[PDB]
Amino acid sequence: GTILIDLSPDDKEFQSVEEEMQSTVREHRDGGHAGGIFNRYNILKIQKVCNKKLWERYTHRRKEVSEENHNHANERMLFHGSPFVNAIIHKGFDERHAGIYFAENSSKSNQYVYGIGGGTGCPVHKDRSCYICHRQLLFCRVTLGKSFLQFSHSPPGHHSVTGRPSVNGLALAEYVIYRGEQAYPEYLITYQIMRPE
Ligand SMILES: CNCc1ccc(-c2[nH]c3cc(F)cc4c3c2CCNC4=O)cc1
Ligand SMILES: [Zn+2]
């Protein structure tokens, strides 16, 4: 079902997606332990993810949410890092793998590409701060609907949870959904973290 369409660096769609990647990098409280030490990425490839069934599933649910929330899907574009990115682009998101988490900060999602807290890092060097091995992240279209505000299935009468960072100073929000149909994996981004100079 799924085809991946390569986007050219000269395409405005490539450029807008890359800019969201780069401009949402932040410093983390672990000093780079989980995701590595970097201020920007080397973008190697951006692919548009096209799948008819997963898209129709996304839009059907989006309409339901919208009608339960004064015609407002509250749709966002958010990052998702996972060792299971290949399964996600072909089979879509699945809540049973308790919710499904998404980040406004690309560098937050980058912490989860090799597993929880970075796991043991890249397969070949076992380095969580590897500047060599290629990483992959999803930039996803996400339906939040009526989102339950959390100061840091979904709560009754809500479609999602918003984790508003209270303690952290420069952190952006993180979101949780409980229905896999409320997220569509729209862009597959292949990159390296870049060593600072
Ligand atoms: C549920 N098992 C523990 C657990 C493991 C990972 C995550 C988690 N929190 C996130 C916040 C965020 F902004 C983005 C992500 C995550 C994840 C893992 C899923 N991917 C994310 O990018 C949450 C809970
Ligand atoms: Zn490596």
Swiss-Prot record:
Record protein name field: Poly [ADP-ribose] polymerase tankyrase-2
Function as written in the Swiss-Prot or TrEMBL entry: Poly-ADP-ribosyltransferase involved in various processes such as Wnt signaling pathway, telomere length and vesicle trafficking. Acts as an activator of the Wnt signaling pathway by mediating poly-ADP-ribosylation of AXIN1 and AXIN2, 2 key components of the beta-catenin destruction complex: poly-ADP-ribosylated target proteins are recognized by RNF146, which mediates their ubiquitination and subsequent degradation. Also mediates poly-ADP-ribosylation of BLZF1 and CASC3, followed by recruitment of RNF146 and subsequent ubiquitination.
First and last residues shown, out of full length: 952 to 1161 of 1166
Record note on modification: Ubiquitinated at 'Lys-48' and 'Lys-63' by RNF146 when auto-poly-ADP-ribosylated; this leads to degradation. Deubiquitinated by USP25; leading to stabilization.
Subcellular location(s) of the protein: Cytoplasm; Golgi apparatus membrane; Nucleus; Chromosome, Telomere
Residues annotated as domain PARP catalytic: 8-197
Residue pairs linked by disulfide bridges in the UniProt entry: none
Binding site for Zn(2+): C122, H125, C130, C133
Tissue specificity remark: Highly expressed in placenta, skeletal muscle, liver, brain, kidney, heart, thymus, spinal cord, lung, peripheral blood leukocytes, pancreas, lymph nodes, spleen, prostate, testis, ovary, small intestine, colon, mammary gland, breast and breast carcinoma, and in common-type meningioma. Highly expressed in fetal liver, heart and brain.
Assembly: Oligomerizes and associates with TNKS. Interacts with the cytoplasmic domain of LNPEP/Otase in SLC2A4/GLUT4-vesicles. Binds to the N-terminus of Grb14 and TRF1 with its ankyrin repeat region. Interacts with HIF1AN. Interacts with RNF146; this interaction leads to ubiquitination and proteasomal degradation. Interacts with NUMA1.
Family membership: Belongs to the ARTD/PARP family.
Organism: Homo sapiens
